[PDB]
Structure formats: structure tokens, C-alpha cells
Amino acid sequence: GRGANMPFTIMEAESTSNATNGTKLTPNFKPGDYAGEASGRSSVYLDATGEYVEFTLTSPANAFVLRNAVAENTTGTVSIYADGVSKGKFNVSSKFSYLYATPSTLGRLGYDNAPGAGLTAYWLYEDAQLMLDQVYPAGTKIKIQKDAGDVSWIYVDLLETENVAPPQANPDPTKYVAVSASKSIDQALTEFRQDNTKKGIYIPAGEWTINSKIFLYGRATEIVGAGPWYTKLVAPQSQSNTDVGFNISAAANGSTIRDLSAWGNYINRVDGPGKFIDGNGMQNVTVQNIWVEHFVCLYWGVNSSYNTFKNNRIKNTFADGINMTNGSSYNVIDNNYARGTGADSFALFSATGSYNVGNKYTNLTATNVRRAAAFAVYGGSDNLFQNLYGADTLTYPGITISSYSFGYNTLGFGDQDTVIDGATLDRTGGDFWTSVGADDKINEYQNFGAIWIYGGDRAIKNILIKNVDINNPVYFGLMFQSMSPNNMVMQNIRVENVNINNPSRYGIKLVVRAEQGQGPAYGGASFTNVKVNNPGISAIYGEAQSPNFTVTRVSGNNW
Ligand SMILES: OC[C@H]1O[C@H](O[C@@H]2[C@@H](O)[C@@H](O)O[C@H](CO)[C@H]2O)[C@H](O)[C@@H](O)[C@@H]1O
Ligand SMILES: OC[C@H]1O[C@H](O[C@@H]2[C@@H](O)[C@@H](O)O[C@H](CO)[C@H]2O)[C@H](O)[C@@H](O)[C@@H]1O
Ligand SMILES: OC[C@H]1O[C@H](O[C@@H]2[C@@H](O)[C@H](O)O[C@H](CO)[C@H]2O)[C@H](O)[C@@H](O)[C@@H]1O
Ligand SMILES: [Ca+2]
Prior knowledge:
Distance between the termini: 28 Å
Assembly: monomeric
Structural class: mainly beta
PDB class: hydrolase
Organism: Paenibacillus glycanilyticus
Largest sheet: 12 strands, parallel
Oligomer: monomer
Keywords: GH87 alpha-1, 3-glucanase, catalytic domain
Number of strands: 45
Bound molecules: a molecule of 2 linked components (GLC-GLC), a molecule of 2 linked components (BGC-GLC), calcium ion
Name: Alpha-1,3-glucanase
């Protein structure tokens, strides 16, 4: 029960509770693979008419999201049945999936949408959303079945089920200017700004074009939809990579955007444009119960403080889900669900104001991270990451804790703890970068544990990791590394109440030589009640070869 508390239930297609006459994939950790990229590292392949996967509802549902893979450059249907009776068709498509690179150019993952000579397809899964005209009770058999006229083949990865309430009306037509078939979002906002009795705008159920960046100014503005399944803001879908959404000027600090969805038209990553909400320096803004897809990011804060992002769904983006940078402090990032981000799902990048401080990243779920980490913290002071669920990273840790500057002006970690408290990390880690001349070499890449503690070129200190379960990480549970030649001494690094279950290589790795010119870790870390269970090779690697690093076994360690 770690992570976000969402109204939808997620059921893996391959669950043993699901009858099927299709083909259940054996798991692997390979990017560019229909198993490796699936939630749970497996899917059920339906490849003939009449092949099905049968789900059983554990909670009532009238609405469904099917994560699936179909052929490149295709659209079509797959059928849904309730208790053996056909009830509709999902619109399945690869419009937003299939991003191309090569095994040695994973730095391009997400950027390049066109197939080409010698190029491998990655980011193979996408989603289909469907609402049915009845609430089906728990115990209903919901069958996904490939009938005549459906797509030639489909990998079924998981099903979201949800009991969606009826749409919520305009809270008060005399205070919220309604968008309508003949009144645009921009026109409603102009009416709002020019009449001080208005609190904001209401966007009814429907599909509403957002073909521009919509600027909020004048004063604090409320933007209220009917619910994310009902109010859909849609980037022009015959265009691609249009920078649309909202941009909140300082005059509109204190605004609220809630209860709606935003459907972008990005088909690859672009660096600069592409955040659904822009709000450089924004303060006291609330973004609540919105569902956003196919943007580069939901939000990328820049000295943005005292904001609240709550109850949101961030799916299938081309870079970070939410990042808060360059002084962003005292933000509440609470109870958000991310799946399929294109870079760090939830991130905090501290830079020069000296540190990002006082942020609370709580009750967060980040899964199917298509590049980089589920959670990432780059420097900062007095920031909390609490009750996290991360799973199924393609290329990188579940949690990155790093004092590398990336060339920006930053002091690294500060004098108050950065705390990871309560986290479950399932099948996290992966391959990235290169390992030429590396120690402990198993392939052409650097190899990443579920949690990466990386001392870079800035101070690495005051890190507390506690109450973490790490299940079946690709390679390692905890991976400690110091950048040479800087050799920053890690101080006050403590690990408490951690279970590392079935890591394929080591429970703990102290990186001895990541690549040519690099050396072992500097400083130390303490371990209290850290259990390593059934490691593939050994509980800990690198201790005897890291003479500048002290492992302190306080108590309760079985290694
Ligand atoms: O603060 C660093 C820069 O952040 C943003 O651009 C990011 C870019 O550097 C790269 O990391 O990709 C992400 C996602 O597309 C970009 O958001 C700002 O746009 C840029 O002005 C900053 O210098
Ligand atoms: O050195 C410049 C690059 O630094 C970072 O990436 C490092 C990478 O090059 C390799 O050496 O591995 C280390 C980790 O062991 C990486 O941190 C930046 O991420 C990259 O953008 C720079 O080009
Ligand atoms: O061509 C636009 C769009 O069509 C499909 O998605 C539908 C979406 O437009 C509408 O708002 O909701 C429908 C029911 O949930 C969706 O099926 C395609 O799936 C999508 O790729 C495409 O952009
Ligand atoms: Ca699955």
C-alpha cells in the first residue's frame, strides 16, 4: 500500500488470477522488448481471433485504461466483454509509442520518432481509455478479447479499473465563467479578469482545443473542470509537438487548476517547450486532480515555492513528470501517480538562494519509467521523500541521490537531512552510459542499483534512507559511488530498516571503478537492520577494494 492512493485499481494482465488462451511473456529487463518494457516485465500477447485475457474486478468500475502494445503506425480496436457479453471496443494506437535509438545511443531515448536503418524501437507501450455506460460490480469478469475486425495482434500489459462519479457541474455560474461551444477558454478568462465578482472559469465536460499557451494574469484564478474523465483539454491532434497549456504569470500566483485532463500532441521529447503548465517563480499555486499525457513535462519549477500538486495523474510524457529546480522550496507534491514518464518521474534539482529546501514529496507512485529514475534528488537541504512506490525502470535507479552539478551553479547537499522514508522499489535499476575499462564488468554499460548514492563534484552529506523494501532489483539494492578526481567525502549517510530481496548480483555495491579513470567511494555509510536476501552473487561487493570508504554495521545486518 505504499505510494499514491488513487481511485483506480491496477491489475496485471499476466496475473495468475486471469484466465487466458493467449501467450504470457516470460519476464526480462530489456528495453526495446515487449516483456522488458511491460509493467511487471510481462504482458499477455493476443495473436489470434478469439484470444483473450479475463480480468476479475475487485472494486466496482465503469471506466478502464488498457496499457497495450500494437504494431508501429497502426490504429484499431480490441474488444471488451462483461460476464461474457460484448460491451465495446478500445481505440488502440501506436501514435504516441515507438521511439528509436540504438543500444549505444540510449542518450537519444525519447527524442527520435522516426524509424530508420539500423534503429531499434523502444517505448513500445501506450494506453487506451474507455468508459462504459454501466457500473459493473466487484467480481465482474472483464474480458479483453481480440475479435474479428480488431487489430492483428496486441500485447495486453495491465488494466486500470475505476468507478468514475458523474461529471461535476459549474460550482456557481455567477462566479465561474463557463467555457462553451462558442466561448473559448481565452474568452472566458478575459471575462473573468474584467469582472472582479468572478472567481475563475469552469470548463464543462467535453473536448476543448488548446492550441496555445493560455496565460493567467490579473489575479489569482480558479480553473475548474468536471473531472478528468470528462473535461479534456486537447492539443490539435493533427499537429505534433505543439507547446500548449497554461502559463501562470506572477499576478496569478495563488491560482488553482483542478478536475480536468490535458491531452498533448507531443510524439517525442523537445528540450525547452513542452511543459503543460509553465510558472517560473510561481507561488501558492494548486494543481489538483488533473490527468496529463503526451507533454514533455507536467511542470518544471524554477524558484517556485509554496505550491501544491495533489491527486494528479502524469502518464506517457517525454521527459520529467514534475521537476522543481533552482530554489524551489516548501512545495507539497502529494498523492500523485506517474506511469511512463520520459525522464525522472518526480525530481528535485537544487541550485542557486542557496538550496531547494523544505519540500515534501509524499505518497507518490512512479512506474514504467521509460528513462532515468522514478525519484531523483540532486542536492538540496531539508527535503522529504516519504511513502514512495517505484517500479519497472528501463535504464536507471528507482531513486537517484546525486551531488553532481551537471555544469550548473549548485552547492550540492546542505546541512539538513534529505530523507527517503518508506519506499517500495520493484524491479528498478538498469543500464546506461558506458563502462570502458570498468571493474565488475558485465556488459557495455554502467549498471545501476535500485538506489544510487552518487557523490559528484559537490557536497554529498546528510542523507537518510529508511524503511525501504527493494524487490528483485535488476542488479543491486544500494549502489554507492564517488566521482574521481573530486572524491567528495560522503558524510552522515545512513540506511535503516531496509530489505533487499533477490538482487541478481549484489545486495550492496561499492563502485570500485565505474569506467577508465574512475576510482572507489570516499567517506562511509551506516547500516541498521539492513537485510540482503538471496543475492545472485554475494551480499556486498567492493568493501575490501574501497579503502577510503567505511561501512558501519550498526546492528541487525545479515552481511
Ligand atoms: O535548469 C536547466 C534547464 O532546465 C530546462 O530545460 C531542460 C533541459 O535542460 C533538459 O534537461 O530537458 C528538460 C526537459 O525537456 C528541459 O526542461 C529549462 O527549459 C532551461 O531553460 C534550463 O536551463
Ligand atoms: O562528464 C560529462 C557528463 O557527465 C555526466 O554523465 C556522466 C557520464 O559521462 C559517465 O561518465 O558516467 C557518469 C556516472 O558514472 C555520468 O554522471 C552527465 O550526465 C552528462 O550529461 C555529461 O555529458
Ligand atoms: O485522433 C485523436 C485521438 O483519437 C484517439 O483517442 C481518443 C480521444 O481523441 C478521445 O478524446 O477519447 C477517446 C476515448 O477515450 C480516445 O479513444 C486515439 O487513441 C489518439 O491516439 C488520437 O490522438
Ligand atoms: Ca504486465
